[PDB]
């Protein structure tokens, strides 16, 4: 196979010379004309008291009112923010739960974790209380993260270095995607639900689209195990953190990676990120027990959501932008205005 | 609350009613104990797809022992998710300071030698010790 | 879902009796409970309410200290005692489920009623009491409120309901804006404070009777004079 071989660097490097004539700076390096946030300060609106564990995913309603949130005490909780007030609770199947997701109508819930099994719950019936929808099996490796379609559709990646879109009613596979050498660990819906992101502990990312069961692109240059991974609503970027103590933001058009954001006081990997409504505010958690409000055009300025006192596992903001969720290992939901 | 309507005061008492029973839910929770098995595993097993979970007593304290003996790779989510555990059964950034009892035949290690009955009696000891120092730990007393 | 009320009959005056409900097809726990009051010939009439927990229990100014009302979860049933009766008191009975929390349905399925014979307050105003309607014609009914039942938060605790002849009242709006499951879509009504207004597309069949329209701004609960329709 050495013409193939040598072929491929031919393209490497028909690659490199391309992104050489294209490439000149980065987003923080003219964007510094934007006037910096500076010092902003947030604080505590409510607190959301109740779960009694290490909390490990929560996911906002679109309606920008209610919040489901999963504990490690095997609990799954749904909120009324405005009141403080406790909507649902749902016991799970096991404890070992990692990710959750809303269902974007309103009528479902769906979980899952290391059984090997991702559980679908249906909010309003007639009975007037909560069941099990479906189970869909199949995976042999524990489930990372899951994302509604719409009502019938949903998509999963699990430690057997594969990823899953799967068809609720029927209960079998309709697409699989196979490709990863290690274990992959999140992955993100875009906002038109036409294309995946999903990151894996191979120091790689890829694209993927539910109606071609092929990627187009990886994404690479971290370290180490990639742990967080989002997207910037308008659908043409997604940021990445990573446990080599650095968040990036990577770019679909070009070919590359946009931002880093990195500082020594960071000896840890970072838990989780999330982006602002408007795309001025990222945020992102640590495990030096802060949560950093980074600015995504400046690279440089930064708040602090002060308050938690052990490690902040999963943060995000509303539809409408006007408050945010943090969940940690503190046991609290903390809203934040 | 007399500013809110008629219909506040049914959602507050659903939500205090939801309160309660978490609280219940909870406090049975937290008094059952977790063992990793991993491996005189042979006789553990059985004295007391994927990785399995089990659910035994002793000595009116309540056990919970996972197995996952085919774990013979790196943990990516095993170890992530195995920081809450009381006690690794034997026979990197997480497990630098968790008890390792081991049977033959800060990371403080035992050993153990053993009708057979030991095999359960001797975890249990490890277990009341693997308590008693974190408690101390809180008081400041050690 | 069923709900089958029981305990009706006939009384001489003097005295005192009882009724029950036994319900079958939900989870009863999480459900308040209604008991309200039909004239032989008029209107409804509310008359007590039960809360999910026990802990809130509701009478009317009428006659209060008279009646009582239970509940009794491990076996799914539902009570009311009531004592002294006079002649003000012939009528039929039902039980009315209802559940709260952040949008919920309250109000949405009725019993089916028993008889039971014997030998301050927002006002509401129903604007008439008939109107002749013919197939395939659009119909408006409106009533009329002496308060602003609307809240700063927006809820407005105004309800719609229709009663066929020779059956039990149907929901069909909850908080005066909102269609409940199992209605058609031809069904709609809006208003502004004081002054609401019950629309129907296309009259096509099975729409005659009486119709009503209530609210739940605060105890008591009151009703109008009611609707009747002729085809």
């Known amino acids: 196979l050495d013409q193939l071989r040598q072929e491929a660097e031919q393209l490497k490097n028909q690659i490199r010379d391309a992104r050489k004539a294209c490439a000149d700076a980065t987003l923080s390096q003219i964007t510094n004309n934007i006037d910096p946030v500076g010092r902003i300060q947030m604080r505590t609106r409510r607190t959301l008291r109740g779960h009694l564990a290490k909390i490990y995913a929560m996911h906002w309603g679109t309606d920008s009112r209610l919040l489901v949130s999963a504990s490690q005490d095997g609990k799954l909780i749904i909120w009324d923010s405005y009141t403080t007030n406790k909507v649902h609770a749902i016991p799970l199947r096991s404890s070992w739960v990692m990710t959750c997701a809303y269902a974007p109508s309103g009528n479902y819930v769906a979980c899952g974790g290391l059984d090997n099994i991702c559980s679908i719950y249906n909010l309003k019936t007639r009975e007037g209380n909560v069941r099990v929808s479906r189970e869909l099996a199949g995976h042999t490796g524990y489930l990372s993260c899951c994302r509604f379609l719409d009502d019938n559709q949903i998509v999963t990646s699990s430690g057997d270095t594969t990823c899953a879109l799967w068809d609720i009613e029927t209960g079998q596979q309709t697409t699989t995607f196979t490709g990863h050498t290690g274990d992959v660990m999140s992955l993100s819906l875009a906002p038109d639900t036409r294309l995946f992101v999903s990151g894996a502990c191979d120091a790689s990312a890829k694209l993927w689209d539910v109606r071609e069961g092929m990627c187009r692109q990886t994404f690479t240059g971290h370290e180490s195990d990639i742990n967080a991974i989002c997207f910037f609503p308008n659908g043409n970027a997604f940021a990445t953190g990573s446990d080599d103590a650095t968040c990036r933001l990577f770019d679909l058009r070009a070919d590359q990676e946009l931002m880093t954001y990195s500082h020594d006081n960071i000896i840890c990997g970072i838990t989780s990120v999330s982006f602002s409504k408007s795309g001025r505010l990222l945020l992102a958690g640590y495990d030096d027990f802060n949560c950093n409000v980074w600015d995504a055009l400046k690279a440089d300025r930064a708040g602090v959501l002060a308050g938690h006192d052990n490690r902040v596992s999963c943060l995000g903001v509303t539809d409408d932008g006007m408050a945010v969720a943090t969940g940690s290992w503190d046991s609290f939901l903390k809203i934040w205005n | 609350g007399c500013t809110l309507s008629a219909e506040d005061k049914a959602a507050v008492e659903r939500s205090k009613m939801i309160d309660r029973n978490l609280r219940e839910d909870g406090e049975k929770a937290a008094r059952e104990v977790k063992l990793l098995l991993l491996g005189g595993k042979s006789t553990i097993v059985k004295q007391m797809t994927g990785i399995v979970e089990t659910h035994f007593t002793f000595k009116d304290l309540h056990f919970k022992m996972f197995d996952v003996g085919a774990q013979r790779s790196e943990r990516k989510k095993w170890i992530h998710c195995f920081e809450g555990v009381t006690a690794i059964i034997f026979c990197n950034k997480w497990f630098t300071d968790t008890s390792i009892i081991l049977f033959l035949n800060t990371k403080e290690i035992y050993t153990h030698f053993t009708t057979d009955t030991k095999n359960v009696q001797f975890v249990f000891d490890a277990v009341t010790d693997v308590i008693i120092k974190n408690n101390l730990k809180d008081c400041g007393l050690f | 879902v069923q709900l089958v009320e029981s305990g009706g009959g006939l009384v001489q005056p003097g005295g005192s009796r009882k009724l029950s409900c036994s319900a079958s097809?939900?989870?009863?726990?999480?459900?308040?409970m209604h008991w309200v009051r039909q004239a032989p010939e008029k209107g409804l009439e509310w008359v007590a309410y039960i809360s999910s927990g026990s802990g809130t229990i509701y009478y009317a100014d009428t006659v209060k200290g008279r009646f009582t009302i239970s509940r009794d979860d491990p076996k799914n049933t539902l009570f009311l005692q009531m004592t002294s009766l006079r002649s003000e008191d012939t009528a039929m009975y039902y039980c009315?489920?209802?559940?709260?929390?952040?949008?919920?349905?309250?109000?949405?399925?009725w019993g089916q009623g028993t008889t039971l014979t014997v030998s301050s307050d927002i006002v509401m105003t129903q604007a008439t009491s008939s109107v002749p309607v013919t197939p395939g014609e659009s119909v408006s009914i409106s009533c009329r409120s002496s308060?602003?039942?609307?809240?700063?938060?927006?809820?407005?605790?105004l309800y719609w309901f229709l009663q066929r002849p020779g059956q039990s009242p149907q929901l069909l709006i909850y908080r005066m804006s909102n269609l409940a499951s199992g209605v058609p879509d031809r069904f709609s009504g809006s208003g502004s404070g004081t002054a609401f207004t019950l629309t129907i597309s296309r009259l096509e069949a099975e729409d005659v009777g009486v119709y009503y329209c209530?609210?739940?701004?605060?105890?008591?609960?009151?009703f109008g004079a009611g609707t009747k329709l002729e085809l």
């Open positions: 009315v489920r209802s559940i709260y929390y952040y949008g919920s349905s309250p109000f949405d399925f």
């Open positions: 308060k602003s039942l609307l809240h700063s938060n927006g809820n407005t605790y």
């Open positions: 209530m609210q739940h701004l605060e105890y008591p609960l009151t």
């Open positions: 097809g939900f989870a009863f726990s999480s459900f308040g």
